[PDB]
Design goal:
This is part of a larger assembly, with 7 protein chains of 7 kinds. Chain D is of the alpha+beta class and 121 residues long. Chain D is built from 2 helices and 2 strands, in the order βαβα. Chain D has one domain. The chains are: A mainly alpha (51), B alpha+beta (100), C mainly alpha (32), D alpha+beta (121), E alpha+beta (34), F alpha+beta (168), G mainly beta (106). The structure holds 3 RNA strands. Chain D: One of its GO terms (cellular component) is nucleus.
RNA sequence: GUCAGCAUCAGUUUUCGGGGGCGGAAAAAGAAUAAGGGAAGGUGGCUGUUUAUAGCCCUUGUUGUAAUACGUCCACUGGGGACUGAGGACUGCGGCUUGCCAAGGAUGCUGACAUAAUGGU
RNA sequence: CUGCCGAAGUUUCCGGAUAGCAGAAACUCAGAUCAGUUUUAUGAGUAUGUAAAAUGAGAGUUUCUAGUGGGCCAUUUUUGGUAAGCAGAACUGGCGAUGCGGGAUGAACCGAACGUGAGGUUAAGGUGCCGGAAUGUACGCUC
RNA sequence: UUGAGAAGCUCAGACGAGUAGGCAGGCGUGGAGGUUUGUGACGAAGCCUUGGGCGUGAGCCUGGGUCGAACAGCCUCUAGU
């Protein structure tokens, strides 16, 4: 049993065996949708650009 | 197993999002948000088994770092933090991310 | 060739005693 | 499973080349200062168990058969079931008459002979 | 040996630091120079 | 590649000091780990604040607000030499505060053979008015009609057929 | 006479070695016209041959050839490492090699 | 029997790309376009001055959810190279659907060459 | 001939025993004990000694039987000093039983510890030529 | 599935310097008992050889040559090994 070690990060079939979840992963997801709310306190900006 | 893996991955994403929102609100409020102190540390032995003081040799034996380029996971706490300080010249350690 | 009157590179015994000379300087400053 | 040899050169005894009184047969150097015993730079090698060959192909000839010494026809019949595993090797002191009987019987059994052509021609 | 008493009275180390908010409106940072 | 890092830190809250003072430093380091180490070094040597008793509350890299505007930066440093006690002031003309500090570190290690740990940057300022410039080579840069032939030009393909032009 | 030479000209520099230990299994070959490891990537896997002449007429011909293949670049200057069927003789240092254009991938 | 070439895979590995998330001053800039401020290493004008017959710097608005760099991630993806092929009916874990499969270790298709190549000594 | 295990390198008492290090034999022990280790707590003077969590490892004894009882080198503390050397301890290290890469060459320097091999990648040191690898990039200094 | 020389077969993992010392398994030689329906004047033993093969090794087998009367494998015994 297990004559050879197969790397799941390279062997898709072995990864499917180990993880019965990789078939539904969807790594790339729109999370910064709608608009981007620039959030930077004026106090924080002043101290950042201080001295 | 599939449901557990889905729950764990959702937990990772929620924690990453939560930390980012927590930082953003403090920046917007002008306040400072300290991140959580890491509980996990990955330790890689960088020096070989030759010319080691007996104290360091015993510590790396407890860490199971018996060979150069050997890595282990450790729970970061007081006893671990000071033990890593003693063998600090002989190993390198840091906070591993999920990919690591 | 070199135009020097002495070999700029010394002997291994000569450099070894220089580390001993550096040891003497530490003795002069620290204890002596 | 081809026949693989970890080494083809023999292990000659140290200084056996310089002196004729020192034979080539390997002798373990006992001197506590022997540079070759200490395995210094450029020194000749010493026999080690790591040099040992694969157990499956060990004792096998390049053709893949193991040599079996045969003295008369009776030994040839002993190789009836092992003709794909063993090759008959006729002994040096077996006379010409018995060689032709050994070779002919080996041909009938389909058994390879390592030196079939000796004293028989 | 009062340590023996401590055990009898007692009959996990402090974890790594907890994240907490830090208020700077009361105490604005002061720039430091060596 | 150095980076400018705003490091704000303070000692851990206690009953004696429930609201510890937050100290901020603008210091340069290749990475955040070095910057937080240098911050702790300066804080200990000034306020005697122990690293264990303290904590880093904020770390932020600071980019150059005007990286495309040539400027002159004056840097005060505490040079460590054979005697280990010297103060220097230098002025470098470039478009980035990080670049001026990088030139400062290279210059000091070149002229005075001073290492990174021996050197401690005291303050970096931007000299916007031409008059406050104290260095003659800098002033010659701020002249209006600055023009000069290119110096130090010098220019696998071994065995070139013709001779180099090494001119215009 | 300009209708041939479908090969690239190369030279057998030396063996893959340290300061004192030589490894004759793989050789260092300088392909002329190649001046960086990026350019050496083109010649990786090409067939390099060492062509020499002998007195005996084997196969009715006095020309013998040792085959080999470029494996990986060696250094920043564009030299490559080649492994031959027979390890090249040490007398062939500085001798001319022929880098074929196949197996082609263009 | 020997030695070759290629293909499709497995293991280890190296070297080029492409695409896409997320993060930070939710990059900094910048560009374009509206306010105000300042001036110069002072332009047109007349050494001295304040955009005119050059322009620049600072602040704000806007175009904006700008882009880009850098960091990080993709159970995203396209190529090039090298070395290795242990084992030997069937079991197992899986995937696609009884079957098929890259899923408990290489097969397939050809060549050439034996009057030599290979392996020796 | 091959293989396996493998020291001591010196206390403590009168050249011998005891012990230590290494094995064997025969036992009991895994809801147990250990540790060239670190925390926590107690006191006492940044260290100390005592006790009680972390991490690692199965942890214990009895018999009896080999070999060992030197030295050299180096760091630190300290004791004196002297034209100047050095002299006296302690301390644990390195060598010693041990090849290999580098340092042009080397008992003590930097790396690294060894079955036979293929591939990959590095340490130390290196990339003008000898010599494998940039007559690399950027900023200075020097005649 | 035949793979029970159970002293055998098979699966898995780790490991590999080594003095003093300890332990184990093997190679070779003279002679003895047993055995091989053993080898041999159609050539024993020996010797020689840029012949071949096996073993990590001690060593073993074999081709060709020379040679001319005896010798070997296996199991045990023994030693002036």
């Amino acid at each position: 049993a297990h004559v050879q070690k197969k790397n799941p990060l390279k062997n898709k079939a072995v990864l499917s065996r180990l993880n019965p979840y990789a078939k539904a992963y969807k790594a790339n997801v729109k999370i910064n949708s709608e608009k981007t709310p620039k959030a930077a306190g004026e106090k924080f900006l002043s101290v950042l650009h201080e001295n | 197993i599939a449901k557990r893996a889905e729950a764990y991955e959702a937990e990772y994403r929620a924690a990453e999002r939560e930390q980012i929102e927590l930082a953003r609100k403090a920046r917007a409020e002008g306040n400072y948000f300290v991140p959580h102190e890491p509980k996990l540390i990955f330790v890689v032995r960088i020096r070989g088994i030759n010319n080691i003081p007996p104290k360091a040799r015993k510590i790396m034996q407890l860490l199971r770092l018996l060979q150069i380029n050997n890595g282990i996971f450790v729970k970061f706490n007081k006893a671990i933090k000071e033990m890593l300080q003693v063998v600090e010249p002989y190993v390198t350690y840091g906070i591993p991310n999920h990919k690591t | 060739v070199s135009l020097k009157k002495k070999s700029k590179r010394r002997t291994t015994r000569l450099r070894s005693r220089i580390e001993k000379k550096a040891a003497e300087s530490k003795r002069k400053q620290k204890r002596a | 499973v081809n026949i693989i040899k970890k080494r083809t050169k023999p292990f000659k005894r140290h200084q056996s080349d310089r002196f004729k009184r020192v034979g080539e047969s390997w002798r373990k150097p006992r001197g506590i200062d022997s540079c070759v015993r200490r395995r210094f730079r450029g020194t000749i090698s010493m026999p080690k168990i790591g040099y040992g060959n694969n157990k499956k192909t060990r004792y096998c000839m390049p053709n893949g058969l193991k040599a079996f010494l045969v003295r008369n026809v009776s030994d040839v019949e002993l190789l009836l079931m092992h003709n794909k595993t063993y090759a008959a090797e006729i002994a040096g002191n077996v006379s010409a008459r018995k060689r032709v009987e050994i070779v002919e019987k080996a041909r009938a059994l389909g058994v390879k002979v390592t030196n079939a052509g000796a004293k028989v021609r | 040996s009062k340590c023996r008493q401590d055990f009898l009275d007692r009959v996990q180390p402090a974890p790594p630091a907890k994240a907490h908010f830090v208020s700077t409106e009361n105490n604005e940072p002061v720039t430091l120079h060596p | 590649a150095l980076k400018e890092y705003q490091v704000v830190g303070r000692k851990v809250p206690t009953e004696h000091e429930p609201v510890p003072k937050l100290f901020r430093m603008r210091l340069f380091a290749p990475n955040e780990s070095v910057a937080k180490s240098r911050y702790w070094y300066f804080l200990k040597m000034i306020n005697k604040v122990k690293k264990a008793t303290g904590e880093i509350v904020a770390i932020n890299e600071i980019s150059e607000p005007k990286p495309l505007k040539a400027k002159v930066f004056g840097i005060w440093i505490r040079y460590d030499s054979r005697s280990g006690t010297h103060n220097m002031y230098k002025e470098f003309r470039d478009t980035t505060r990080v670049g001026a500090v990088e030139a400062m570190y290279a210059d000091m290690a070149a002229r005075h053979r001073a290492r990174f740990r021996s050197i401690r940057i005291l303050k970096v300022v931007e000299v916007e008015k031409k008059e406050d410039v104290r260095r003659n080579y800098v002033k010659q840069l701020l002249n209006p009609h600055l023009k000069f032939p290119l110096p130090h030009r010098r220019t696998k393909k071994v065995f070139a057929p013709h001779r180099p032009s090494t001119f215009y | 006479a300009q209708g041939h030479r479908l090969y690239v000209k190369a030279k057998h520099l030396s063996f893959q070695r340290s300061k004192h230990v030589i490894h004759p299994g793989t050789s260092i070959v300088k392909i002329e016209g190649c001046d960086s490891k990026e350019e050496a990537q083109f010649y990786l896997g090409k067939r390099v041959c060492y062509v020499y002449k002998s007195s005996k007429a084997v196969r009715g011909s006095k020309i013998r050839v040792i085959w080999g293949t470029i494996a990986r670049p060696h250094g920043n200057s564009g030299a490559v490492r080649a492994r031959f069927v027979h390890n090249l003789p040490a007398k062939t240092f500085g001798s001319s090699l022929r880098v074929m254009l196949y197996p082609s991938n263009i």
